[PDB]
Amino acid sequence: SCRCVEQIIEKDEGPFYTHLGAGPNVAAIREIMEERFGQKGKAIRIERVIYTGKEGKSSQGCPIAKWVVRRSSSEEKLLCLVRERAGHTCEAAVIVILILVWEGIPLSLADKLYSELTETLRKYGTLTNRRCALNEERTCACQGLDPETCGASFSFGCSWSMYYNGCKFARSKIPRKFKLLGDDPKEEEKLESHLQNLSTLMAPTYKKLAPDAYNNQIEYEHRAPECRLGLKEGRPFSGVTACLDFCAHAHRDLHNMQNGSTLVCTLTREDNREFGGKPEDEQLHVLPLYKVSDVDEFGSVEAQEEKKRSGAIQVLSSFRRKVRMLAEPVKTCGSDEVWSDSEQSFLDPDIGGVAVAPTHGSILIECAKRELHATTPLKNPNRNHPTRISLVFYQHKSMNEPKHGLALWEAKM
DNA sequence: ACTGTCGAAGCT
DNA sequence: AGCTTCGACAGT
Ligand SMILES: O=C(O)CNC(=O)C(=O)O
Ligand SMILES: [Fe+3]
Ligand SMILES: [Zn+2]
Ligand SMILES: [Zn+2]
Ligand SMILES: [Zn+2]
Numbered sequence: 001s002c003r004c005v006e007q008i009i010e011k012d013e014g015p016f017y018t019h020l021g022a023g024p025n026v027a028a029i030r031e032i033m034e035e036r037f038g039q040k041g042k043a044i045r046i047e048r049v050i051y052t053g054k055e056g057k058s059s060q061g062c063p064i065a066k067w068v069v070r071r072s073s074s075e076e077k078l079l080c081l082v083r084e085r086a087g088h089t090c091e092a093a094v095i096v097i098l099i100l101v102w103e104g105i106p107l108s109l110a111d112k113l114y115s116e117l118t119e120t121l122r123k124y125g126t127l128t129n130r131r132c133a134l135n136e137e138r139t140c141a142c143q144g145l146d147p148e149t150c151g152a153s154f155s156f157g158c159s160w161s162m163y164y165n166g167c168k169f170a171r172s173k174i175p176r177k178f179k180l181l182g183d184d185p186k187e188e189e190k191l192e193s194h195l196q197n198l199s200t201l202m203a204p205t206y207k208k209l210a211p212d213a214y215n216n217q218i219e220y221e222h223r224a225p226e227c228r229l230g231l232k233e234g235r236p237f238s239g240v241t242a243c244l245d246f247c248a249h250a251h252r253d254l255h256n257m258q259n260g261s262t263l264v265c266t267l268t269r270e271d272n273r274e275f276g277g278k279p280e281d282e283q284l285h286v287l288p289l290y291k292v293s294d295v296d297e298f299g300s301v302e303a304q305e306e307k308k309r310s311g312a313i314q315v316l317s318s319f320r321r322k323v324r325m326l327a328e329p330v331k332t333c334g335s336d337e338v339w340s341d342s343e344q345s346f347l348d349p350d351i352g353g354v355a356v357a358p359t360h361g362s363i364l365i366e367c368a369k370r371e372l373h374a375t376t377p378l379k380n381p382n383r384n385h386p387t388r389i390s391l392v393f394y395q396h397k398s399m400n401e402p403k404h405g406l407a408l409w410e411a412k413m
Numbered sequence: 414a415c416t417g418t419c420g421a422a423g424c425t
Numbered sequence: 426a427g428c429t430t431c432g433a434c435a436g437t
Pocket of ligand 1: 243253285
């Protein structure tokens with residue numbers, strides 16, 4: 001382990017890791033997942049995806065989906081995406097790259113967080129600028145152009161910093177982990193309470209469904225408690241980002257800690273909260289370097305064709321649409337209409353773009369540090385009534401000092 | 414052989 | 426409120 005080859009050419013077989021789960025064959029994965037979830041059979045659905053290393057993107061460089069994995073029934077509880085490693089016959093020949101639990105949190109609590117975060121971030125939220133907010137040319141308008149309504153990212157908790165090679169709060173007497181506009185401690189505590197309670201609720205589910213990644217993240221819980229979220233023993237998270245109609249361009253989260261993962265809690269607008277329903281718009285979570293198999297979990301071609309026809313796997317087609325492009329790139333230190341298209345991505349069967357359509361209250365686990373990932377731009381982004389809110393829970397690298405690493409930094413004298 | 418990042422404190 | 430120090434790394 002391993003001897004199937006003599007070097008790991010990730011650029012071809014894809015990134016290799018096992019802390020979400022690994023096994024000799026797809027059947028093995030099902031055994032693991034049935035045991036973890038505590039449910040055999042139809043509750044669990046496994047989709048083979050294939051690493052192609054060729055990125056699906058629009059003519060302007062923005063995210064697109066080529067296939068959508070959709071919840072097949074109310075009977076489906078757990079979605080797993082597995083990669084069969086090209087040219088391997090060992091005990092980690094198949095690995096888990098994504099876990100999605102459809103019924104992640106209580107719907108009543110999801111409904112509430114939707115209202116409360118939308119209202120709170122609206123009024124007091126100070127947005128966090130991220131590289132993945134723009135395409136590579138830095139001229140797209142995927143978030144919308146109205147500053148008041150555009151899709152945005154709001155980051156809370158602790159973050160790693162290059163200046164300190166540690167927590168950004170190295171020099172902070174009393175850190176404000178849930179900092180809002182100006183200074184309004186009653187709103188900030190209200191936000192905190194919501195996100196701490198949510199951190200607390202999700203950690204047990206993280207442990208249950210991805211033990212090894214979870215255990216990696218709590219190794220230093222008692223050494224750096226100031227850089228952890230959560231209200232109870234077992235605190236895998238350190239940072240949390242809220243994304244409101246935010247189009248995250250293809251990226252990896254480089255600052256995240258090695259051998260961890262990301263948990264994403266999804267909240268949707270009220271028109272998209274029933275199974276099978278027909279929402280005006282919809283945001284997808286995409287893995288641009290993968291394609292779907294010709295075959296289902298158990299090896300059948302016909303079973304996989306049924307899913308394509310039922311819609312459990314939606315095969316999308318090329319599209320021409322108009323989008324705006326800034327006259328001048330966004331820096332760091334007016335616009336025109338342009339025809340965007342995806343024909344090229346769709347022409348090549350090996351250009352990727354496997355997407356999932358995460359539901360209200362669902363929880364998605366992936367190794368965002370390793371896998372390229374993206375979210376699709378909304379037709380009409382409006383963070384005042386967003387089509388989708390995602391709450392992304394993570395822990396950065398080198399967050400293992402007490403007191404946000406205060407002593408270690410003052411020691412650098 | 415360059416670029417660019419889920420920043421905040423202290424002084425002015 | 427603006428101007429300054431603080432600098433680890435993956436990508437290309
Ligand atoms: O919102 C999602 O589904 C995924 N989000 C991200 O990758 C991010 O904010 O970095
Ligand atoms: Fe990400
Ligand atoms: Zn874009
Ligand atoms: Zn092998
Ligand atoms: Zn911290």
